[PDB]
Amino acid sequence: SQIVLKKFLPGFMSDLVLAKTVDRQLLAGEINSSTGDSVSFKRPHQFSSLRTPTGDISGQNKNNLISGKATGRVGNYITVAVEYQQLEEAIKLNQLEEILAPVRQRIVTDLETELAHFMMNNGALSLGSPNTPITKWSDVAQTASFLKDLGVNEGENYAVMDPWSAQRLADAQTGLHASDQLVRTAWENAQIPTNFGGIRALMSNGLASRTQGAFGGTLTVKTQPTVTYNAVKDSYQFTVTLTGATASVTGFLKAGDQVKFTNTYWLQQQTKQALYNGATPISFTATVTADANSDSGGDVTVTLSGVPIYDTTNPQYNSVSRQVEAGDAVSVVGTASQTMKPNLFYNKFFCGLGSIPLPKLHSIDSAVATYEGFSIRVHKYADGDANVQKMRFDLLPAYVCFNPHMGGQFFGNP
Amino acid sequence: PNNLDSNVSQIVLKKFLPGFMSDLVLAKTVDRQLLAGEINSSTGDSVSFKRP
Amino acid sequence: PTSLDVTSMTSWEYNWFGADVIYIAKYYEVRKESVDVISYRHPITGEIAT
């Protein structure tokens, strides 16, 4: 009842795959003391052609030159702080080393959870119905096929799924017919290969989950929005208002919901031709960014990520077949208020990540802790005359969204 | 029309313009050897010198 | 008139009576300068002489 061991019991731990896959090259050591609190990148240029029988362009308009931007900003602090009575703390706990172990992993887990939230909030592409899980081989190959169909080449493509989904895919490998290595590996270790369907497939247990958000009624747009390139050449975000909703519901659309425009299709970005999904055209979709309520009269104003550019004076930047106008029909994927864990798929150049070094506070003892390439500043002080020491850990990340049309969520389809 | 204002950046140089300044004559002219090293905050707040 | 350097160093626990001392200092500098060397090459009694 008195004697105690000096070694703690083991605990539970998540895994980190999001940080190790996203781009950590372009945004690194760029938000310094001189840059400020934000930094921006450039965008590629696109040109259109004028077809004339004799080569005369005098009447027509030569291509104009418009430059875009992609801004990255800093986030909030990741701070964990504790206080203790040092007499009872130092009873058998030597040098306060036991606090160090479960705090860096807490910081890393929170950072990764917020990164996943940001990634699924800003992604535009969607595939399959949210209800259906992943059970077959095509459910993974569809993501790679879609990404190749859009036309992205420079980079690497990755897909992330929960532990159970890997087991269901692994069982399919056991039933293969001629590959001895594959069936033996799946039977013994239950490990799928690195490249599953042409896309680098990964497994992660810690994956953020979201709720749908209650909606009801045949939604449609009342006012033609502005989707000209000049308006959205800096953010790829646009605002739109809807009608036909329910009378008055708070939290009508949560963050991360996918709104699909039925009659507007995607385009092969280089050839500017429509996309055909084997038997049906692929419709345009957008992601909710901020929570939106509905007022009396059934009017919902929401901000969406991903723009259906159909500028008529700059045809070279089109990405959809037709211009979205009033009276169009839209729908929201999923059920009323179900909660599910989304599966993410993205290109290498979709979201960035970086860290801002933190200086030591004057006349306060401190140190640096490293954990998977993250530096954590630990500070100790003795405020108060009640023998209450305090220790705090800090970390300051920064995110950036390059192109919303290069990633998103995906599920299985029946 | 060409709208290419996002191709450049606003720059604030690392140069400081000259300021204003004063001069020191009164401090140099006074006698400083007599009072130097004669007053301590803990010991007291006054010193005395003897008249001829 | 005479202006002396100030150090505020001595008089630390000592009685001073002679205000007839002026403090002067010598200043030393080392510089890198360009100098032209002339090579008198008279062969008699040694030739190479720079």
Question: Angle between the A180-189 and A163-174 helix axes, to the nearest 10 degrees?
Answer: 140
Beta bridge partners of A210: A340
Show Cβ contacts of residue A1 under 8 Å, excluding neighbours closer than 6 positions: none
Under an 8 A CB cutoff, do B33 and C11 touch? Answer: yes
**B4 touching A (Cβ < 8 Å):** yes
- Tell me how far apart the alpha carbons of residues A195 and A169 are, in angstroms, rounded to a whole number: 13
Nearest to A71 by CA among A235, A214, A181: A235
List residues of chain A with CB under 8 Å from any CB of chain B.
42, 64-69, 230, 233-234
For B3, which residue in chain A has the nearest alpha carbon? Answer: A66
Under an 8 A CB cutoff, do A67 and B4 touch? Answer: yes
Interface test with C, best of B28, B33, B35, B38 (most C CBs within 10 A): B33
Closest-CA distance of chain B to residue A62, Å: 10
Find where tokens 């329910």 sit: A246
Residues in chain B: 52
Show Cβ contacts of residue A260 under 8 Å, excluding neighbours closer than 6 positions: A126, A283, A284, A285, A330, A331, A332, A333
User: CA distances (Å), C26 to each of B28, C23, C29, in order?
Assistant: 22, 10, 10
Question: Residue A245 class from Cβ within 10 Å (0-12 exposed, 13-18 middle, 19+ buried)?
Answer: buried
Closest-CA distance of chain C to residue B15, Å: 29
For residue A138, what is the DSSP state? H
Q: Which chains are adjacent to chain A, needing at least 3 Cβ pairs under 8 Å?
A: B
- Tell me how far apart the alpha carbons of residues A65 and A47 are, in angstroms, rounded to a whole number: 9
User: CA distances (Å), A364 to each of A331, A386, A410, in order?
Assistant: 56, 19, 48
Torsion of CA A124, A127, A129, A135, to 10 degrees: -140
User: CA distances (Å), B51 to each of B33, B48, C16, in order?
Assistant: 17, 10, 17
Residues of B in contact with A234 (CB under 8 A): 6
- Tell me how far apart the alpha carbons of residues A131 and A133 are, in angstroms, rounded to a whole number: 6
Closest-CA distance of chain C to residue B51, Å: 16
- Tell me how far apart the alpha carbons of residues A275 and A308 are, in angstroms, rounded to a whole number: 14
Entry resolution (Å): 3.7
What angle is formed at CA B10 by the lines to CA B7 and CA B11, rounded to 5 degrees? 125
**B52 touching A (Cβ < 8 Å):** no
For C13, which residue in chain B has the nearest alpha carbon? Answer: B37
Technique of determination: cryo-EM
Under an 8 A CB cutoff, do A67 and B1 touch? Answer: no
Residues of A in contact with B7 (CB under 8 A): 42, 67
